[PDB]
């Protein structure tokens, strides 16, 4: 019992060894430490202090070294002996981390048993050259419309999720992970994702809610969660995306697909801000350092789709932004946006007014993220992206001209917006989403009025499988629509519209 666990521990330690170099600290505190000595230390080495706390060498100076403390101030004291770990700052990598909760140090902090690792690989690494890169081809499915192919994301994309924080920002991301569960248990290993959800600056309470929620939804057995919560000090939050991303790359160079969600990169900027100012480095534009840019660009380009050589591996990214009231005059949001391609502009105003997901499509774009989609998912959504940016202009002046043609577009457009909505935390299947967008694209929401859109949807799906599942077997396997299949669907949709 209580005697046995202690007896085990005391025996599992001895804590007798013979050392190389030591320091004795100069004057410690402010989340940065000043150490005296350490004359043979390498750069970015790991040091371990007599407190038990460990730090990463930042400034190597001729007489002193200035470590940065991974941990709260209070434990570090003055006149403690600092010993070289002898190894560069690394975090365990391997497949003994899937369904083990971890912090940014890689410790089990409730855990699901101690941590097993294939390797360790350095927190900080630099991403492969220009040459091993390849464009995306495979679609990421979120199981939510309005992103499905309306605003496309592919496998290796770095496409952004932007909006005001805590408007349900987190759910959009979970659904990506959740929806990929029957392509993630495949026998196609390129189709599996192994996902890391980096929680930076969030409440330790939320993260514990999130760990349980995933185990109910039976999805925690192919995801890792990394933690540098709000309670835990700033230099650990700074290092949190970097350390987690090393873990992501390990999946990517085994030539298998992955995902990593960086929630919230605006909080990495704050974490790095506090550490930066207490080291005497003067603030840049918007009171954030001017080296913020460096962290995000280095960080982001280690999520990239590789070529045939590297096993056609990928690590996709959905970086999650805390916007300062829907302003894009601010430094941190634009820095993440200019590195990335594609945006998933999300509206608070829309979230409140019953659009869940509230994914505005006006300031949402895809650049190179538009070759993700297979043919079925190019046909069905065809030019819906365009039509609802003709709808925006039609409603600016619907406070000039009023014509049937403009009115018709406005009615289709409203009806279409309603259609995009889907239940959250049960993301509707991709095969299931393919018929629904056909209908609306082909203008068949001139027989359904707004109040009944939800009712039609489930009754139309039930109808289609019992009548003809042939259509659906085709889209599961082929993933490309032919004209004949398309017509067969049109014929079926109109039948349902009448009665």
């Amino acid at each position: 019992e209580v005697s046995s666990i202690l007896e085990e521990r005391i025996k599992g330690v001895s804590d007798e060894a013979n050392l190389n170099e030591t320091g004795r600290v100069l004057a410690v505190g402010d989340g940065i430490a000043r150490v005296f000595g350490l004359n043979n230390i390498q750069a970015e080495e790991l040091v371990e202090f007599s407190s038990g706390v460990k730090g990463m060498a930042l400034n190597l100076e001729p007489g002193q070294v200035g470590i940065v403390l991974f941990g709260s101030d209070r434990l570090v004291k003055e006149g403690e002996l600092v010993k070289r770990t002898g190894n560069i700052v690394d975090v365990p990598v391997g497949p003994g981390l899937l369904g083990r909760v971890v912090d940014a140090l890689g410790n089990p902090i409730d855990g699901k048993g101690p941590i097993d690792a294939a390797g360790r690989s350095r927190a900080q690494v630099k991403a492969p050259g220009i040459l091993p890169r390849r464009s995306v081809h495979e679609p990421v499915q979120t199981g939510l419309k309005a992103v499905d192919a309306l605003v496309p994301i592919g496998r290796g994309q770095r496409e952004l999720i932007i909006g005001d924080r805590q408007t349900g920002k987190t759910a959009v991301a979970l659904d990506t992970i959740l929806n990929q569960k029957r392509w993630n248990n495949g026998s196609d290993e390129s189709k599996k994702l192994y996902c890391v959800y980096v929680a930076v600056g969030q409440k330790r309470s939320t993260v514990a809610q999130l760990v349980q929620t995933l185990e109910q939804h039976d999805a925690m057995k192919y995801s890792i969660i990394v933690a540098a919560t709000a309670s835990e000090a700033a230099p650990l939050q700074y290092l949190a995306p970097f350390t987690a991303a090393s873990i992501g790359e390990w999946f990517r160079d085994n030539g298998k697909h992955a995902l990593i969600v960086y929630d919230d990169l605006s909080k990495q900027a704050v974490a790095y801000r506090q550490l930066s100012l207490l080291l005497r480095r003067p603030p840049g534009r918007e009171a954030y350092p001017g080296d913020v840019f460096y962290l995000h660009s280095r960080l982001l380009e280690r999520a990239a789709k590789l070529s045939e050589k590297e096993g056609s591996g990928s690590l996709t990214a959905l970086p999650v932004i805390e916007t300062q009231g829907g302003d894009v005059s601010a430094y941190i949001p634009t820095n993440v946006i200019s590195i990335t391609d594609g945006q998933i502009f999300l509206e608070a105003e829309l979230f409140y007014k019953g659009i869940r997901p509230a994914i505005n499509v006006g300031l949402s774009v895809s650049r190179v993220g538009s070759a993700a989609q297979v043919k079925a998912l190019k046909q069905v959504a065809g030019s819906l992206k365009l039509f609802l940016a003709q709808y925006r202009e039609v409603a600016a002046f619907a406070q000039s001209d009023l014509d049937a043609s403009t009115k018709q577009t406005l009615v289709r457009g409203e009806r279409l917006t309603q259609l995009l909505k889907q239940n959250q935390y049960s993301p509707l299947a991709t095969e299931e989403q393919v018929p629904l967008i056909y209908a609306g694209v082909n203008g068949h929401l001139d027989g359904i009025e707004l109040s009944r859109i939800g009712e039609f949807e489930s009754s139309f799906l039930s109808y289609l499988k019992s009548n003809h599942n042939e259509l659906l077997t085709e889209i599961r396997e082929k993933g490309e629509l032919s004209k004949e299949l398309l017509a067969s669907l049109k014929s079926a949709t109109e039948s349902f519209v009448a009665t």
Binding site: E1, V2, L6
Partner: protein, 50 residues
């Protein structure tokens, strides 16, 4: 069941302060002196082998 859970917690702290008493008992005895010699001969073997 809640009280039993607490009892485990109680047990863990009780057993802690007893070890703090024995640390004080060891440093109080001339074991302080019998054990510094031991440290010395261990340190001799080690430093010889750098």
């Amino acid at each position: 069941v809640r009280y039993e859970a607490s009892l485990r917690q109680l047990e863990q702290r009780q057993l802690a302060k007893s070890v703090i008493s024995r640390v004080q008992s060891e440093l109080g005895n001339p074991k302080f002196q019998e054990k510094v010699l031991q440290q010395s001969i261990s340190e001799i073997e080690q430093l010889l082998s750098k």
